[PDB]
Amino acid sequence: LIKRRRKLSKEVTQMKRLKPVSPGLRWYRSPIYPYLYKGRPVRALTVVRKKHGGRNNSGKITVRHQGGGHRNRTRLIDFNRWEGGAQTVQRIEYDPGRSSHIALLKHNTTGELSYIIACDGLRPGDVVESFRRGIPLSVKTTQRGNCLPISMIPIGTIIHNVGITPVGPGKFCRSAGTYARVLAKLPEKKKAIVRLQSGEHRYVSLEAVATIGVVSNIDHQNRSLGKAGRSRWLGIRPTVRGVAMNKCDHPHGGGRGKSKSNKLSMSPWGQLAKGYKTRRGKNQNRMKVKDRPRG
Amino acid sequence: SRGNTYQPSTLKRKRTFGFLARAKSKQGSKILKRRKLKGRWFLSH
RNA sequence: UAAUCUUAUACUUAAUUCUUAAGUAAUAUAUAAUAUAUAUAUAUAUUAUAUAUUAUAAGAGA
RNA sequence: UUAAAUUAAAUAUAAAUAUAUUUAAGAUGGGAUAAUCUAUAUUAAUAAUUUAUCUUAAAAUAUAUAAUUAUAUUAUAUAUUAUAUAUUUAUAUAAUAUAAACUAAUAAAGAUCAGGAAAAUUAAUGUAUACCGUAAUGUAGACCGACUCAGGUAUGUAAGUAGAGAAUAUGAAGGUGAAUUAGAUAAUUAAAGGGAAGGAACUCGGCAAAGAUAGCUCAUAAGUUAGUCAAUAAAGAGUAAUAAGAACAAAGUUGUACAACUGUUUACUAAAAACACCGCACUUUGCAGAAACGAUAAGUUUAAGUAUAAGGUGUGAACUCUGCUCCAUGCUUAAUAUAUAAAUAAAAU
RNA sequence: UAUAUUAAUAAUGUUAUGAAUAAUUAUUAAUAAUAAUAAACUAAGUGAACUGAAACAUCU
Ligand SMILES: [Mg+2]
Ligand SMILES: [Mg+2]
Ligand SMILES: [Mg+2]
Ligand SMILES: [Mg+2]
Ligand SMILES: [Mg+2]
Ligand SMILES: [Mg+2]
Ligand SMILES: [Mg+2]
Ligand SMILES: [Mg+2]
Ligand SMILES: [Mg+2]
Ligand SMILES: [Mg+2]
Ligand SMILES: [Mg+2]
Ligand SMILES: [Mg+2]
Ligand SMILES: [Mg+2]
Ligand SMILES: [Mg+2]
Ligand SMILES: [Mg+2]
Ligand code: NA
Numbered sequence: 001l002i003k004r005r006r007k008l009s010k011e012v013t014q015m016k017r018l019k020p021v022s023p024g025l026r027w028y029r030s031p032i033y034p035y036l037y038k039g040r041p042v043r044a045l046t047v048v049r050k051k052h053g054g055r056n057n058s059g060k061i062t063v064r065h066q067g068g069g070h071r072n073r074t075r076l077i078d079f080n081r082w083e084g085g086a087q088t089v090q091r092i093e094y095d096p097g098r099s100s101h102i103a104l105l106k107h108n109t110t111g112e113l114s115y116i117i118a119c120d121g122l123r124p125g126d127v128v129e130s131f132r133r134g135i136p137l138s139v140k141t142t143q144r145g146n147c148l149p150i151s152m153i154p155i156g157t158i159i160h161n162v163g164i165t166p167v168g169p170g171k172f173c174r175s176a177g178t179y180a181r182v183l184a185k186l187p188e189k190k191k192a193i194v195r196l197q198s199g200e201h202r203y204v205s206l207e208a209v210a211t212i213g214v215v216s217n218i219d220h221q222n223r224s225l226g227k228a229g230r231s232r233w234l235g236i237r238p239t240v241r242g243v244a245m246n247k248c249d250h251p252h253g254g255g256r257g258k259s260k261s262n263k264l265s266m267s268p269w270g271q272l273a274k275g276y277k278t279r280r281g282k283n284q285n286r287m288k289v290k291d292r293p294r295g
Numbered sequence: 296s297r298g299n300t301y302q303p304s305t306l307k308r309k310r311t312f313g314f315l316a317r318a319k320s321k322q323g324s325k326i327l328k329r330r331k332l333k334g335r336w337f338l339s340h
Numbered sequence: 341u342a343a344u345c346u347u348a349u350a351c352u353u354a355a356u357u358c359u360u361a362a363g364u365a366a367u368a369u370a371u372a373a374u375a376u377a378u379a380u381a382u383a384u385a386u387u388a389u390a391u392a393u394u395a396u397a398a399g400a401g402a
Numbered sequence: 403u404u405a406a407a408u409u410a411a412a413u414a415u416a417a418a419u420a421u422a423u424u425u426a427a428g429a430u431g432g433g434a435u436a437a438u439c440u441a442u443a444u445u446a447a448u449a450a451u452u453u454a455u456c457u458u459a460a461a462a463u464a465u466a467u468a469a470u471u472a473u474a475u476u477a478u479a480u481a482u483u484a485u486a487u488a489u490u491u492a493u494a495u496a497a498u499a500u501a502a503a504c505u506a507a508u509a510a511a512g513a514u515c516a517g518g519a520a521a522a523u524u525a526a527u528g529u530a531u532a533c534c535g536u537a538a539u540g541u542a543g544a545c546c547g548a549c550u551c552a553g554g555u556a557u558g559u560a561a562g563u564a565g566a567g568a569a570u571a572u573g574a575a576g577g578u579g580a581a582u583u584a585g586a587u588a589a590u591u592a593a594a595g596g597g598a599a600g601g602a603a604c605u606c607g608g609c610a611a612a613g614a615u616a617g618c619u620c621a622u623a624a625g626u627u628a629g630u631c632a633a634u635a636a637a638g639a640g641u642a643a644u645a646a647g648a649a650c651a652a653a654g655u656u657g658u659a660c661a662a663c664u665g666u667u668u669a670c671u672a673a674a675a676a677c678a679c680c681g682c683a684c685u686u687u688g689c690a691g692a693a694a695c696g697a698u699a700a701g702u703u704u705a706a707g708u709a710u711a712a713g714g715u716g717u718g719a720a721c722u723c724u725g726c727u728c729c730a731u732g733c734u735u736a737a738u739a740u741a742u743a744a745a746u747a748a749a750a751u
Numbered sequence: 752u753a754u755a756u757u758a759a760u761a762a763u764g765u766u767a768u769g770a771a772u773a774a775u776u777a778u779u780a781a782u783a784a785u786a787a788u789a790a791a792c793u794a795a796g797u798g799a800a801c802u803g804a805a806a807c808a809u810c811u
Contacts, residue, residue, distance in 0.1 A: 020629045023663040027680060027719060030514085040516080048518065049706080054694095056703040057421080062694040063704050063713080070515045071451070074706060096516055099710065162708095164689085167348070167398045170708090171689060177710045196688060198709050205399080221710040226719090228665070228679040233515040238666090238678050241716075252715090264732050265685090265715050269694075273715040275733045278686050278693080285688060286400075292709095295686075295734070297669070299547040299554055321406060321418085332790070346690060400690085417796060697797095 013219045028226030031219040037091040049074040069235025077115040079169035081130035081147045099176035101216045119213040144213030150192045151206045159210040166207030176220035201290035312340045
């Protein structure tokens with residue numbers, strides 16, 4: 001079994017590219033995941049994702065660049081895990097509404113189904129558990145796939161989903177390939193110190209859930225969309241540069257020929273785009289302990 | 296080639312400019328009252 | 341921290357339902373007495389008196 | 403999606419109102435059964451993004467000596483005949499019966515861009531079938547264009563012959579031959595056809611107009627990011643054709659500048675070297691976020707997302723690469739240096 | 752669905768056992784019904800700008 005595991009670890013995810021018969025196919029690059037299920041999700045666990053186009057309830061675009069991608073079904077995925085008891089992972093699926101893969105768990109006592117975010121090496125046929133509801137010697141608990149309060153995880157262990165409050169769901173490190181690490185634990189204050197994917201070291205409540213391991217689809221980073229069309233399919237409308245506009249529209253607008261107009265890089269609404277911290281003064285993350293690396 | 300800007304469809308026109316549409320909203324009510332005060336024969340589509 | 345803020349989720353009487361008042365049962369908390377166990381202190385049981393029937397949990401917090 | 407509509411106190415707001423939440427409205431979609439014609443009422447009980455259907459296998463037909471070769475057939479859609487079971491009406495079986503297209507239904511299955519929402523069964527008792535649309539016009543004299551306007555306007559069928567096709571030719575049937583005619587055809591204009599000898603001498607510039615030696619099957623270099631990308635390569639061949647002899651598809655090679663490329667753009671003078679892009683880089687934001695909107699608020703988008711995400715900024719695929727410089731304007735960290743604004747006792751002239 | 756529903760009765764047809772259950776008609780009683788409404792004048796909330804100042808910002 002150990003040998004098999006080792007072999008699996010060794011095996012790298014290939015990067016599929018078609019023959020460059022069109023100039024757009026030249027730079028399309030996607031990771032292959034062959035163990036990743038083929039078919040559909042469970043209709044009882046999906047709801048329609050209703051497209052907004054980046055328009056607010058005013059009808060006005062509030063967030064630019066959002067637009068008409070493919071039709072999409074949202075999968076209700078469990079970021080909570082309040083169930084407890086073993087669960088066999090039936091299959092690992094593609095989720096269009098997030099970068100990570102998702103795993104379909106069947107709970108063994110009941111036969112009831114749920115989706116989780118898939119951990120890195122998780123595979124169909126594996127078994128995981130949840131320990132929100134206490135334990136009912138120790139190392140059997142801590143293994144990639146299962147969730148538990150941070151109070152139960154050994155210091156130094158890499159984890160992915162991280163809650164903020166005890167009663168609350170996993171908010172942090174849910175994207176493809178991401179992960180956090182438990183740095184310290186303070187029982188007296190009821191806080192643990194977690195370093196998040198950015199590198200910030202932050203206080204999190206002790207009873208806050210986390211699931212062990214790294215988020216799956218680590219190779220997602222390297223995928224190269226090959227053509228404009230692909231972005232469009234993903235609901236990403238084109239971004240127009242300030243410099244290509246007129247002063248009425250953007251601070252960078254105007255000028256005969258291309259020119260930054262000796263104006264500090266800034267947004268269309270005038271706030272600075274390089275370096276300027278936007279959360280500042282009184283409002284600020286109290287639980288910040290050690291700051292992120294750059295700014 | 297411009298000129299043909301009005302592209303009749305009865306549904307759209309009744310729904311947008313119709314009497315019921317006017318009477319349903321406060322602004323619409325104002326308009327109807329205005330037209331009554333002028334003595335217009337036709338208060339809206 | 342009962343400052344501020346955040347998030348989640350029984351009967352009787354009197355003017356078919358509603359409301360009041362009395363007591364009694366039920367649960368909780370506070371105070372007092374008695375019995376037992378352990379190291380003047382902690383735990384359990386019984387009795388007396390008082391109070392309650394927007395809440396609970398989580399978080400930030402002068 | 404919409405709704406002076408709906409929770410002492412739903413929340414917020416100079417008023418108007420706005421917001422989340424319920425309720426109702428809202429087709430462009432979904433909605434039992436049915437020529438062997440069909441009954442929707444009342445009461446009682448407990449679906450589908452796109453796309454393909456190959457290869458194999460099976461059996462059939464011919465050559466040759468069970469096995470090989472070659473060919474077509476292979477999931478469904480009726481009628482006729484002959485059989486066995488309930489009793490001419492039913493059930494199942496066997497045999498017989500073209501082509502290339504199309505339709506619907508069936509099953510199986512490949513791609514990443516991962517593919518709507520919403521209203522149960524049986525039994526008993528029932529049914530007299532409401533309302534409205536229905537002409538004609540609808541690639542137009544009957545709509546939108548001020549006109550009986552060469553413009554704009556959604557869907558299905560669209561006889562054969564021919565062919566890869568809804569190409570192109572004809573046109574069976576149907577429809578139509580018109581609010582201008584009749585003559586004449588000068589100069590001249592428009593839209594065509596032909597042209598000796600020259601072949602770009604024209605002109606800003608081969609603009610315009612010529613120019614196609616198979617549309618099937620072969621054969622196709624350099625260069626290259628290795629993609630018959632270049633390529634529908636040019637040239638060239640096979641079948642057809644020996645100077646008389648349809649229409650339509652198909653019009654060269656090379657160098658340089660600019661931009662990678664397919665795209666988008668000034669509706670009505672500019673389609674480009676401009677925007678976009680895939681990629682590259684910088685940056686803000688830990689979610690009780692950042693960004694945007696919000697007389698401003700609640701609150702919405704961001705997102706049922708969580709730093710491999712999201713917002714902003716520059717550059718704009720890839721290959722070889724990205725030197726030196728924080729003076730200045732910003733941002734950003736560190737302090738000490740250091741001024742000042744409002745806001746206080748009680749007490750002095 | 753006020754040629755409404757409920758109750759009460761009365762004549763009527765059916766079923767199961769003089770009494771019980773459902774159906775229709777007829778009288779009596781009970782139970783809700785319909786924001787078409789002025790205009791100017793008055794008070795209050797918010798409150799421009801053009802303009803004038805021979806420019807304009809205090810002011811208007
Ligand atoms: Mg410009
Ligand atoms: Mg220049
Ligand atoms: Mg007009
Ligand atoms: Mg509107
Ligand atoms: Mg409805
Ligand atoms: Mg016309
Ligand atoms: Mg000349
Ligand atoms: Mg010349
Ligand atoms: Mg041509
Ligand atoms: Mg270009
Ligand atoms: Mg043009
Ligand atoms: Mg580049
Ligand atoms: Mg980014
Ligand atoms: Mg540029
Ligand atoms: Mg006033
Ligand atoms: Na500029």
